[PDB]
Design an enzyme around this catalytic site. Sequence first.
Site, short mmCIF file in Angstrom:
data_model
loop_
_atom_site.label_atom_id
_atom_site.label_comp_id
_atom_site.label_asym_id
_atom_site.label_seq_id
_atom_site.Cartn_x
_atom_site.Cartn_y
_atom_site.Cartn_z
NE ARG A 157 -65.32 -36.54 -27.85
CZ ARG A 157 -65.06 -36.66 -26.54
NH1 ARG A 157 -64.51 -35.70 -25.86
NH2 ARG A 157 -65.35 -37.77 -25.89
CG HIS B 97 -69.22 -36.53 -21.41
ND1 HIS B 97 -69.25 -35.66 -22.50
CD2 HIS B 97 -67.93 -36.95 -21.25
CE1 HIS B 97 -68.02 -35.59 -22.97
NE2 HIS B 97 -67.20 -36.35 -22.24
CG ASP B 98 -66.04 -34.98 -19.12
OD1 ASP B 98 -66.25 -36.13 -18.65
OD2 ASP B 98 -65.42 -34.74 -20.18
CD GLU C 257 -63.61 -33.89 -22.92
OE1 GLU C 257 -64.47 -34.68 -23.37
OE2 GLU C 257 -63.82 -33.21 -21.89
CG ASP D 90 -61.60 -39.66 -24.72
OD1 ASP D 90 -62.32 -39.09 -23.85
OD2 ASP D 90 -60.65 -40.46 -24.47
#
EC number: 2.4.1.19
Length: 686
Positions: free
Chosen positions: A227, A327-328, A257, A229
């Site tokens: 994943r 989380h965002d 992301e 970032d």
Amino acid sequence: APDTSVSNKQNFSTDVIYQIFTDRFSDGNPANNPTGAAFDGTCTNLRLYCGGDWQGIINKINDGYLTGMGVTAIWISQPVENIYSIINYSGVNNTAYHGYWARDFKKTNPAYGTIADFQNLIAAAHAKNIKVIIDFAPNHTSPASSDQPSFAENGRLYDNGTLLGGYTNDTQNLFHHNGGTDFSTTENGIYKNLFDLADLNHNNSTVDVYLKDAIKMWLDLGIDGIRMDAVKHMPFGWQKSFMAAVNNYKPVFTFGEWFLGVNEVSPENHKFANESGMSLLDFRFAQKVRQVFRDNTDNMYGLKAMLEGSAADYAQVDDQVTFIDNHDMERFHASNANRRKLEQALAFTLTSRGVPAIYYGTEQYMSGGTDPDNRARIPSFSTSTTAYQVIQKLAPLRKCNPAIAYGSTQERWINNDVLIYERKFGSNVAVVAVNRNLNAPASISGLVTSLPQGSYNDVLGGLLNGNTLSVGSGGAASNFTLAAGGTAVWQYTAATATPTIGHVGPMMAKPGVTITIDGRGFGSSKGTVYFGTTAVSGADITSWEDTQIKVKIPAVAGGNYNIKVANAAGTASNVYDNFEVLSGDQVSVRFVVNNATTALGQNVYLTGSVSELGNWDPAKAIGPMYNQVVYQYPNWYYDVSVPAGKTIEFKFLKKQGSTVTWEGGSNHTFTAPSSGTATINVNWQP
Ligand SMILES: OC[C@H]1O[C@H](O[C@H]2[C@H](O)[C@@H](O)[C@@H](O)O[C@@H]2CO)[C@H](O)[C@@H](O)[C@@H]1O
Ligand SMILES: OC[C@H]1O[C@H](O[C@H]2[C@H](O)[C@@H](O)[C@@H](O)O[C@@H]2CO)[C@H](O)[C@@H](O)[C@@H]1O
Ligand SMILES: OC[C@H]1O[C@H](O[C@H]2[C@H](O)[C@@H](O)[C@@H](O)O[C@@H]2CO)[C@H](O)[C@@H](O)[C@@H]1O
Ligand SMILES: [Ca+2]
Ligand SMILES: [Ca+2]
């Protein structure tokens, strides 16, 4: 093995991911907990360490929490060593509990565990059929201040204990010294710092090679996926050269992301997902689900539109990672809201295309605003909630009903509040009915499906007030009432007789790498695999089963190819398009062209002699190039992935719409490095 096996690192479409903030899940080993002011065992102060670690994760795996839910992959916090300082941001104290403040990518965060704990994590997970994904954040190190070197750890970077450098006195130029981004443009957000985080400079060979080597370590440690970032904040070409590094070594499913806000649709985002070698977190999906099911700022027609649009915009829609929160964002569930909203959104996600991800605690109805409010400690491990049960009934269908994992999506009935869609793949069907209207039932008449004649029980068992379905001839359902807040799932599965390709991964690699072809009806006898018109059979086909084929990419020219398979009897499958054959290992090279003035709405592009550069096809040129930050207009620049050690001819072009103007003269030429990066600076030839 079958496409569904834990060992399939190339396809997550049949999986359900559970996203965990390591610190906030379970402290199974109090001995590694930070101490003093960096720690809050009550976890009341959300900016400090609470003590959750790998051991804790292992524990929940073994005690049936995750497995009972039907979860088959876990996505965890960046495991690398983080900075140790406590940062006071205007009164408030902050720790690297989140794992986004790297100091050394070759070591672990001791609060999470040792390398040994990491290996155990991988083992226990694998033993329970759970894949492991980690966060990887190569855009930066940590918060730094160039003239206040004493602030934090000055964004210091270490190579396995060895100090490479800091933000202050960066003579090596490991970092960017261009200021902070205002998120004004894409170029602006890439070459400037994100907040105060030291922006790594990917054009520095040291940095380049270091990261490519670091990821290999984790790969060697047995991870199942990555994943990435802040993909929107690093150079596209570099990232593609990074993906190539992973794919040409030990491919694993990678997704990044790229934040999207409400109603935002970006073509840069589509292109990135289609060409970089990785997929993305489906923000478009998330945002739309929230508007519809949560905030009621859009209706079914809007969901429908997102579904059909995304299928057209993403070359591999089934690879986008879906969610309802993370989380965002603030937690989907609001304190005072009706729980059925969360439940429906879950059901919707679990049965939709893509790769579903569940933010830890969702199943517990956690509430919380933005960071750090959405990062609280999981309050309990009860399996008694409705959300837990929803997941529990649906997750498994991804493995047993390929219509869910790889099928197309089709609206069959719709109104402002109700949506009935069908998933289909081979001889498999799934039909989902959702009624967001929490107060009004709906009269469903005229529903036609692909289901065979018979009666169908709600897979949810009525859990969300679903009902039975009655299908007559022609797949026409008889009238029924869909309860307020109603959610139902009906399905049909059967053996597929013709070869049908459901997935391929990785989607980009050099000749010689083995790829995985997943689907159904391949038969048990080795057949043939076609890359465009080239046929592959025999030995290069390392494995062949009904649901999966493993094959080595033949040595064909770099380019894009369609994949198709033929069973032993010669029956061919459907085509899977957009497969990229690299020209070889890749390196990241910065191209610079001086004095290329343009008119408004006219941009400079790059083309050349290799597939990585479009092969002289303007429709496939690289760009538009940048001209603000690193170099200024009329000078243009761009970071591009190219075949290492190759001698390449190239030219620049000015494009406007589809009208193109070529640089005059003769091809510029150059030879790519064998490793590391390089910078080619030339003048535009009129
Ligand atoms: O009869 C096939 C027809 O079914 C669906 O249409 C629904 C429509 O969505 C409802 O809003 C309502 O008007 O009933 C119609 C069926 O009578 C599909 O949407 C439609 O495309 C399809 O032809
Ligand atoms: O910011 C990139 C911008 O560059 C190009 O426009 C040039 C323009 O052609 C020149 O005449 C001059 O005024 O500077 C502009 C760059 O600031 C593209 O035309 C434009 O679309 C692009 O966004
Ligand atoms: O089409 C292949 C061809 O593309 C380029 O040729 C350009 C040329 O550079 C331009 O000056 C203009 O004449 O358009 C040509 C496209 O036909 C490459 O320069 C060339 O090497 C390549 O063969
Ligand atoms: Ca601990
Ligand atoms: Ca950056």
